[PDB]
């Protein structure tokens, strides 16, 4: 629906706070942290995949934080 | 005045080039200008009014269903039809269920089925557009130099309320005496309309750009409805339940007003009740100032015996105000204001009231000025040295320069290449910087945009790491330039 | 001559629908728009809506949201207004004027000005009474 | 939406008088205004288009003026066939709105 | 720096809305028509390239 495409980096800014006033950013971060906290097994699976593919340390950290962020 | 304590205020020095100074001003802040003569003016922006909009689109937010017809033919002979599928006002869907001799038909198959429902609409989004005419900016330009009632109070008639439209021009404004000021606005380089959509819900409105608003779900309808209700969508709204085998059914999806608001986060809001009352956005004046006396030179240094009636009153890095009350037989004269150092006189400050003046009699005139970063003796009397005041601006020189650098970084942020136009009289360097940052921000335009806070800072740290990996001194135009612009842009956006 | 002719007065039931004709004469029928205007007897005038003869787009005011329909016949040079969901407030006199024409379509306002709203060519009037 | 106030609501004057009407708009309608007469229960007639122009076939005793929002209609010499209800009308922005009306009575 | 494609535009007998077409450059431009009190400027921004 209009649950997503949440008009973020479109441009059009100004000096003043726009709609949610730095609450949507913390909303996004807290809900993905909450979803990680509820489902630890997928986090462990993502960590194992990060250790298997890549194998240079920076690539591992990158794809691990990405597979934590791939949730809809 | 009308500009004190409204901090993030835009000091402007220099008038050279004859008289033209380039000012970029917006609804949030205001601009205070200075010159070696031609006394200090204050440019506060107030409401924008786009007069004649035109309605382009209706989205339904809540809907209801009625008359609920359904039909199924037979197992694989016939795909079902229904006579009330003829109106597009009805929503319709084919599916396949099952049929047998229990259902009555025969041949025991997975036969098709239709369902239909009449679509009635509740309160809507009334999205409108405006051309880059039929819109006016109202600017109050107000001068300094006295007149108590309040260095604030933007309500009140001291500064003139001059309108400007793109159907207009050099913007001649008159003040009391001296203030013939000409303003040449360029409103077409402002918000860049024909990319805007004003969006009205039940009470509120928002300013969202056009491609997003066209691209949004929640059924389409064009502006020529009236006797239409021809919503060419509804796969995004009303959903059809189908259980395991048998009869399917219709379901209103409910009001999406909350989901709508969650969609239009990150967009500026706007009150729109009386035609339009458009707010936050910027514009770009060029300012010509010939036509200006100093409200009389034409006077004397005054007699003496002044009196303070107000405090020390420091505002916002240096701007300190003092309200004095002249006592005596003035026949209105000037005010011998100075900002001195200690003994063996080394007078070093600046006065931003230039040529302050007493009015007719007892009336508490007020004066703003900027001391240096430390000790200072602000003096106003003359013949029995009448009155000194001690003041200590805490400050720094280096901290002031660093805060000015942060202001310049915020101008490299939100306001675009207009902030390269925010200075004046630059000739070669300012113009070539504006053109270079024009093409540079065009390459970092759409062109890597559309990304949120988190993903911008993450793409910043990954690109600054791949710049840190240091191949063949591409690491500069990589790593340091890109890391600075990405981090100092990402932590400042989404305001 | 420059002339329009409407239909005779009608009386209909509440909740029914009524159809009023507007026939043209004296000019090229696709050189002007047709516009419909009502007048309650204890009231002044009130605009109902707009049809274009060339092509056939319509629009109407917000007070008639979904209640009004406008068609035409180019061969007879005639415009039909059909008002649906009749109630007692609809008892009024109906009018159909013409507008100077943005060639293609609709109720444009920037091309100078329509030029009448609606008493140069308009006709003789259609009284419609909603009663039981 | 755009409102239009017509003033005054009713007048009485003698034959040969000069009478003026005033219409006020809540928005800028810069020239889009029309003035009409209406004989009661009759077929009515345009008087003024563009708030300043006569229609050909209208006698010269009628006139109109005004630019911004306030507009003045003027009959120079009132005549006994001019008893009618007079309307002013906006053309701009298209929720097209009439004035309320102005009835005349001959003394 | 522009060009006028109306070349030598001319007023008719009296009030009659004469019209003029012209080509600005690809950016900012001030289209001006008045003379002695500089009567009328208009700002225009051809987006272009
Ligand atoms: C801001 O300006 C208004 C308008 O001048 C001030 O209202 C005036 O206050 C003085 C104080 O004695 C009165 O004499 C005037 O009659 C007031 N003008 C009016 C009511 O129109 C207002 O006081 C100012 N704001 C502040 C904080 O002083
Ligand atoms: C829908 O049902 C109502 C009553 O059930 C009826 O009055 C109405 O006419 C129906 N709609 C159509 C289009 O027949």
Longest dimension (CA), chain E: 40
Instruction: Give me B258's structure tokens.
Output: 């909350």
Contact D31 C113 (CB under 8 A): yes
Q: Cα B167 to chain center, whole Å?
A: 22
Separation in Å, CA of C47 to nearest CA in chain D: 6
Cα→Cα distances B434→B18, B361, B419, B439, Å: 22, 50, 9, 9
SS3 call for E30: strand
Decide: helix, strand or coil at residue A31.
helix
Residue C120 contacts D, CB cutoff 8 Å: yes
Whether D contacts E, i.e. 3 or more CB pairs less than 8 A apart, is no
Q: How many domains is chain C partitioned into structurally?
A: 1
Give the C-alpha separation, B333 to A39, whole Å.
78
Q: Which of B151, B156, B161, B363 to mutate to test the pocket of ligand 1 (most atoms within 8 A of CB)?
A: B156
Local structure of E45: helix, strand or coil:
strand
Q: What is the 3-state secondary structure (H, E, C) of chain D?
A: CCCEEEECCEEEECCCCCEEEEEEECCCCCCCEEEEEECCCCCCEEEEECCCEECCCCCCCEEEECCCCEEEEEECCCCHHHCCEEEEEECCCCCCCECCCEEEEEC
Distance CA B383, CA B134 (A): 59
Give the H or E element holding residue E31: strand E28-32
Largest CA distance in chain A: 46
Q: How many Cβ atoms sit within 10 Å of the Cβ of residue C45?
A: 26
Maximum CA extent, chain C: 45
State in Å: Cα C62 to ligand 2 middle.
24
CB B409 within 8 A of CB B493: no
Rounded to whole angstroms, the Cα distance separating B263 from A2 reads 5
Look up residue B424 and give its two tokens: 């004046």
Task: Give the resolution to one decimal, in Å.
Answer: 4.2
Within 10 angstroms of residue C62's Cβ, the number of other Cβ atoms is: 8
The C-alpha of D29 sits at a distance from chain C's nearest C-alpha, in angstroms, of 11
Q: Name residue, tokens 């100032």.
A: B289
What are B276's two structure tokens? 């339009």
Distance CA B356, CA E34 (A): 40
d(C-alpha A6, C-alpha B262), whole Å: 7
DSSP β-ladder status, E22-23 and B172-173: unpaired
Q: Which residues lie closer than 8 Å to B101 by C-beta, 6 or more apart?
A: B108
Among B219, B245, B218, residue whose Cα is nearest residue B231: B219
Tell me how far CA of residue B359 lies from CA of B143, B297, B321, in angstroms: 15, 14, 18
Count the neighbouring beta carbons within 10 Å of the beta carbon of residue B389.
12
Give the span between the Cα atoms of B256 and B258, in whole angstroms.
5
Q: What is the rounded CA–CA span in Å between residue B291 and residue B285?
A: 17
Measured in angstroms, the CA of A28 and the nearest CA of chain B are apart by 9
The distance of Cα E44 from the centroid of its chain, to the nearest Å, equals 10
Distance D1 CA to ligand 2 centre (A): 33
Helix (H) or strand (E) holding E22: strand E22-23
The rounded distance, in Å, linking the Cα atoms of D48 and D36 is 7
Partner chains of C (3+ C-beta pairs under 8 Å): B, D
CA-proximal residue: ligand 2, atom 4 (nearest): B67
Distance separating alpha carbons of residues D72 and C71, to the nearest angstrom: 38
**Cα separations (Å) of C83 from B152, C66, C97, C129?**
58, 9, 17, 12
DSSP label at residue E37: T
| Host domain of residue C102 | 1-132
List the structure tokens of B453. 């806070």
Distant-in-sequence, close-in-space partners of B483: CB < 8 Å, separation ≥ 6: B460, B463, B464, B467
d(CA B157, CA B144): 14
CA dist A24 and A21 (Å) reads: 8
Please give the structure tokens belonging to residue B99.
């049929």
C-alpha to C-alpha distance for B84 and C66, rounded to whole angstroms: 19
Sign of CA dihedral B464, B465, B466, B470: positive
Spatial contact of D47 and D40, defined as CB atoms under 8 Å apart: no
User: For residue C124, which residues of chain D lie inside 8 Å, CB to CB?
Assistant: 43
Handedness of CA D56, D57, D63, D65 (dihedral sign): negative
Atom 14 of ligand 1, residue of closest alpha carbon: B149
- Cα gap D32→D66, rounded to integer Å: 11
CA dihedral B4, B8, B14, B18 (to 10 degrees): -90
Between chain C and chain A, are at least 3 CB pairs below 8 A? no
| Whether the Cβ atoms of residue B250 and residue B117 lie closer than 8 Å to each other | yes
Q: How far apart are CA D89 and CA D29, in angstroms?
A: 10
Residue A41 host element (H or E) = helix A40-52
Tokens standing for residue B389? 């005041």
d(CA A48, CA A62): 13
Angstrom CA distances, B22 to B46, B161, B224, B280, B293, stand at 19, 20, 44, 20, 21
* Measured distance CA(D90)–CA(D30) in Å, rounded: 10
Closest to D82 measured CA to CA, from D34, D36, D24 = D36
Among B275, B276, B277, the strongest candidate for a mutation testing the D interface, having the largest count of D CBs within 10 A, is B275
CA-B67 nearest atom, ligand 2: 1
Q: Which residues pair with C87 in a beta bridge?
A: none
Q: Which residues contact D53 (CB under 8 A, 6 or more apart)?
A: D64
D93 close to B (CB below 8 A): yes
List phi, psi (to 5°) of E24.
-80, 175
Separation in Å, CA of B138 to nearest CA in chain C: 25
Question: CA A64 to CA A60: how far, in whole Å?
Answer: 6
How far apart, in Å, do the first and last CA atoms of chain E sit? 15
The answer to whether C79 and C97 have CB atoms below 8 angstroms apart is no
Protein residue with least CA distance to atom 6, ligand 2: B67
Edge-to-edge strands, sheet with B54-55: B54-55, B128-129, B196-200, B205-209, B268-270
The span from the CA of B336 to the CA of C14, in Å, is: 85
Question: What are the residues whose beta carbons fall under 8 Å from the beta carbon of C81, sequence distance 6 or more?
Answer: C19, C20, C22, C36, C48, C49, C51, C68, C69, C70, C94, C96
Calculate how far, in angstroms, residue B84's C-alpha sits from the geometric centre of ligand 2.
Answer: 12
Q: How far is CA C35 from CA B285, C3, C70, C106, in A?
A: 45, 15, 10, 10
Burial of B230 (0-12, 13-18, 19+ CB in 10 A): middle
How many residues in total does chain E contain?
49
Q: What is the CA radius of gyration of chain E?
A: 13
The tokens for A32 are: 């993905």
Number of Cβ atoms within 10 Å of the Cβ of B270 = 19
A10 to B199, B386, C122: CA distances (angstroms): 16, 60, 52
Q: Name the nearest CA neighbour of B218 among B174, B256, B181.
A: B256
Q: ∠ CA C58-C60-C65 to the nearest 5 degrees?
A: 120
What are the beta bridge partners of residue B302?
A: none
Nearest CA to B119 out of B242, B213, B228 is that of B228
Hey, how many other C-beta atoms are within 10 angstroms of the C-beta on C26?
10
Contacts with B, A 8-47, CB within 8 Å: 8-20, 22, 24-25, 28-29
Chain D CB contacts of B51 under 8 Å are 27-28
B2 interface with A at CB cutoff 8 Å = no
Bridge-partner residues for D64, per DSSP? Answer: D73
- Which CA distances in Å does D15 have to B21, B127, B148, C8, D60? 64, 53, 59, 37, 16
Neighbours of E27 (CB within 10 A): 13
Q: Cα–Cα distance between C98 and C118 in angstroms, integer? A: 7
| Helix or strand run (H / E) with residue A42 | helix A40-52
Q: Which of B101, B85, B105 is nearest to B93 (CA)?
A: B85
Half-sphere exposure (Cβ direction) of B25: Cα atoms closer than 13 Å: 30
Burial B398-408 (b: 16+ CB within 10 A, else e): eeeeeeeeeee
State the Cα–Cα distance between residues B41 and B143, nearest whole angstrom. 5
Edge-first strand order for the sheet with C10-12 is C10-12, C126-130, C92-99, C33-39, C45-51, C58-60
Q: Quick one: B180 exposed, middle or buried, by C-beta within 10 A (0-12, 13-18, 19+)?
A: middle
Q: Which residues contact B397 (CB under 8 A, 6 or more apart)?
A: B373
Phi, psi of D80 (to 5 degrees): -70, -15
| Segment (H or E) for E29 | strand E28-32
Query: Which residues 6+ apart lie within 8 Å of B364 measured at CB?
Result: B148, B309, B310, B323, B324, B325
Which H helix or E strand runs over A64? helix A57-69
- Ligand 1 cavity residues, CB under 6 Å: B 149-150, 153, 156
**C-beta separation of B245 from B97 below 8 A:** yes
The alpha carbon dihedral of B333, B339, B341, B342 has a sign of positive
Q: Please write down the HEC assignment for all residues of chain C.
A: CCEEEECCCEEECCCCCEEEEEEEECCCHHHCEEEEEEECCCCCEEEEEEECCCCCCEEECHHHCCCEEEEEECCCCEEEEEECCCCHHHCEEEEEEEECCCCCCCCCCCCCCCCCCCCCCCCCCEEEEECC
Pair of tokens at residue D45:
């007639």
Between CA B199 and CA B209 the distance in angstroms is 10
* Cα end-to-end span (Å), chain C: 39
Coil, helix or strand at residue A52: helix
The dihedral sign for the CA sequence B260, B266, B267, B269 = positive
The 3-class secondary structure across chain B, one letter per residue, is: CCCCCCCCCCEECCCCCCCCEEEEEECCCEEEECCCCCCCEEEEEEEEEECCCEECCCEECCEEEECCCEEECCCCCCCCCCHHHCCCCEEEEEEECCECCCCCCCCCECCEEEEEEEEEECCEECCEECCCCCEEEEEEEEECCCCCCCCCCCCCCCCECCEECCCCCCCEECCCCCCCEEEEECHHHCCCCCCEEEEECCCCEEEEEHHHHHHCCCCCCCCCCCCCCCCCCCCCCCEEECCCCCCCEEECCCCCHHHHHHHCCCCEEECCCCCCCCCCCEEEEEEECCCCCCCCCCCCCCCCCCCECCCCCCCCCCCCEEEECCCCCCCCCECCCEEECCCCCCCCCEECCCCCECCCCCCCCEEEEECCCCEEEEECCCCCCCCEEEEECCCCCHHHHHHHHHHHHHHHCCCCCCCCCCCCCCCHHHHHHHHHHHHHHHHCCCCCCCCCHHHHHHHHHHHHHHHHCCCCCCCHHHHHHHHHHHHHHHCCCCC
* Rounded distance between C-alpha atoms, residue B67 and residue B217, angstroms: 25
Which among D35, D83, D85 is positioned nearest to C117, based on CA atoms? D35
- What's chain B's length in residues? 495
Cα–Cα distance, B326 to B324 (Å, whole number):
6
What is the spatial distance between Cα B279 and Cα B268, in angstroms, rounded to a whole number?
A: 9
CA dist A16 and B27 (Å) reads 9
């Amino acid at each position: 629906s209009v649950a997503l495409v949440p008009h973020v980096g479109m441009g059009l800014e100004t000096r003043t706070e726009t709609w949610m006033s730095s609450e949507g950013a913390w909303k996004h971060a807290q809900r993905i942290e909450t979803w990680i906290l509820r489902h630890p097994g997928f986090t462990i699976m993502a960590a194992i995949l990060a250790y298997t593919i890549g194998t240079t340390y920076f690539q591992r950290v990158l794809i691990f934080i990405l597979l934590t962020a791939v949730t809809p | 005045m009308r500009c004190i304590g409204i901090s993030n205020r835009d000091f402007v020095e220099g008038v050279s080039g004859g008289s033209w100074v380039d000012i970029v001003l917006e609804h949030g802040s205001c601009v205070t200008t200075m010159a070696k003569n031609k006394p200090t003016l204050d440019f506060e922006l107030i409401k924008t009014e786009a007069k004649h909009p035109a309605t382009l689109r209706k989205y339904c937010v809540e809907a209801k269903l009625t008359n609920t017809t359904t039909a199924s033919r037979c197992p694989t002979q016939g795909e079902p039809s229904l006579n009330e599928e003829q109106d597009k006002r009805f929503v319709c869907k084919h599916s396949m269920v099952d049929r047998g001799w229990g259902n009555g038909c025969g041949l025991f198959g997975k036969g098709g089925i239709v369902t239909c429902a009449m679509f009635t609409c509740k309160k809507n989004m009334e999205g409108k557009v405006v051309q880059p005419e039929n819109l006016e900016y109202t600017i109050v330009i107000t001068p300094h130099s006295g007149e108590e009632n309040a260095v604030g109070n933007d309500t009140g008639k001291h500064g003139k309320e001059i309108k400007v439209t793109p159907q207009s021009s050099i913007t001649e404004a008159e003040l009391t005496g001296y203030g013939t000021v000409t303003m040449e606005c360029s409103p077409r380089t402002g918000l860049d309309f024909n990319e805007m959509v004003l969006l009205q819900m039940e009470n509120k409105a928002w300013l969202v750009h056009r491609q997003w608003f066209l691209d949004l779900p929640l059924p389409w309808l064009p502006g020529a409805d009236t006797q239409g209700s021809n919503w060419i969508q509804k796969e995004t709204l009303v959903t059809f339940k189908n259980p395991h085998a048998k009869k399917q059914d219709v379901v209103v999806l409910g009001s999406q007003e909350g989901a709508m608001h969650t969609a239009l986060t990150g967009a500026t809001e706007i009150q729109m009740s009386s035609g339009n009352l458009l707010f936050t956005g910027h514009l770009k004046c060029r300012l010509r100032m010939d036509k200006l006396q100093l409200k009389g030179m034409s006077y004397s240094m005054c007699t003496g015996k002044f009196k303070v009636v107000k405090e020390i009153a420091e505002t916002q890095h240096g701007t300190i105000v003092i309200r004095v009350q002249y006592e005596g037989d003035g026949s209105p004269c000037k005010i011998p204001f100075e900002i001195m150092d200690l003994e063996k006189r080394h007078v070093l400050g600046r006065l931003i009231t230039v040529n302050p003046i007493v009015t007719e009699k007892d009336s508490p005139v007020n004066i703003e000025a900027e001391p240096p970063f430390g000790d200072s003796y602000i003096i106003i009397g003359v013949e029995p040295g009448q009155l000194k005041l001690s003041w200590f601006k805490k400050g720094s020189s280096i901290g002031q320069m660093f805060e000015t650098t942060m202001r310049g970084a915020k101008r490299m942020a939100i306001l675009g290449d207009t902030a390269w136009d925010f200075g004046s009289l630059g000739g070669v360097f300012t113009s070539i910087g504006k053109a270079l940052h024009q093409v540079f921000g065009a390459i970092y335009g759409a062109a890597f945009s559309g990304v949120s806070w988190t993903m911008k800072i993450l793409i910043g740290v990954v690109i600054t790491w791949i710049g840190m990996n240091s191949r063949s001194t591409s690491l500069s135009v990589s790593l340091v330039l890109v890391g600075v612009v990405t981090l100092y842009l990402g932590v400042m956006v989404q305001a | 001559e420059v002339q329009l002719v409407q239909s005779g007065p009608d009386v209909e039931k509440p909740g029914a629908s009524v159809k009023v004709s507007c026939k043209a004469s004296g000019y090229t029928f696709t050189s002007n728009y047709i516009h419909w205007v009502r007048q309650a007897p204890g009231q002044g005038l009130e605009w109902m809506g707009v049809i274009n003869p060339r092509g056939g787009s319509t629009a109407s005011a917000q007070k008639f949201q979904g209640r009004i329909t406008m068609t035409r016949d180019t061969s007879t040079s005639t415009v039909y207004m059909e008002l649906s969901s009749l109630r007692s407030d609809d008892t009024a006199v109906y009018y159909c004027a013409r507008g100077g024409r943005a060639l293609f379509y609709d109720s444009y306002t920037t091309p100078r000005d329509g030029g009448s709203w609606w008493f140069d060519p308009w006709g003789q009037g259609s009284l419609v009474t909603v009663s039981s | 939406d755009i409102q239009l106030t017509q003033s005054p609501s009713s007048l009485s004057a003698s034959v040969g008088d000069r009478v003026t009407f005033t219409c006020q708009a809540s928005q800028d309608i810069r020239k889009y205004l029309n003035w009409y007469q209406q004989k009661p229960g009759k077929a009515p007639k345009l008087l003024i288009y563009d708030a300043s122009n006569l229609k050909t076939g209208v006698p010269s005793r009628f006139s109109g003026s005004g630019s911004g929002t306030d507009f003045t209609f003027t009959i120079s010499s009132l005549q006994p066939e001019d008893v009618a209800t007079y309307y002013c009308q906006q053309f701009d922005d298209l929720p097209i709105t009439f004035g309320q009306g102005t009835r005349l009575q001959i003394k």
